[PDB]
Amino acid sequence: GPLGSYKNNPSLITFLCKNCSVLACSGEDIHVIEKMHHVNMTPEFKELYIVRENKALQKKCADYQINGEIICKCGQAWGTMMVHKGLDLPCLKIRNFVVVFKNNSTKKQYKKWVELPITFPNLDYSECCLFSDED
């Protein structure tokens, strides 16, 4: 049975690949930016996703330089690889991922992180302005 308490913990939930369903990362293993942008500051995840050479995604004239479109092993557009002055911030899309609850044996498929009733942390990359070398 369930016999649980709360389910608003990103520790019980995890992200998977829609196409497949491989654990790419966990909610708790994710950071938020102004609760407006979802950036996955996971290094190990860099070995779970592959970027393909495509300009159909990234753009020159912009403020957020992208590398292309991130895709799982199978090749499922996990989202996109955003860059900030040379930073690495992979923006995944729940519309390409899945959410599996640990508390109870179930699998919920969302579209946006906003749909996630689970509360997330708040990590402001800007916090560090050291690396800042460019103008």
Tokens of 47: 């070995």
**Residue 59 to residue 56: CA distance in whole angstroms:** 8
The interface region with Zn ion, picked from 31-39, 67-75, 86-94, 119-127 by CB under 5 A, is 67-75
Annotated binding-site residue? 72? yes
Burial of 5 (0-12, 13-18, 19+ CB in 10 A): exposed
* Residue from 2, 4, 54, 74 binding Zn ion (CB under 5 A): 74
Binding of residue 50 to Zn ion (CB under 5 A): no
- By the rule CB under 5 A, 16 interacts with Zn ion: no
Minimum CB distance to Zn ion smaller for 58 or for 76: 76
Whole-angstrom Cα distance, residue 98 to residue 75?
Answer: 15
Residue 20, annotated ligand binder?
yes
Residue listed under structure tokens 């930073």: 87
Q: Single out the segment in contact with Zn ion by CB under 5 A; choices: 5-13, 55-63, 68-76, 87-95.
A: 68-76
Structure tokens of 118?
């689970």
Residue closest to Zn ion, measured at CB: 20
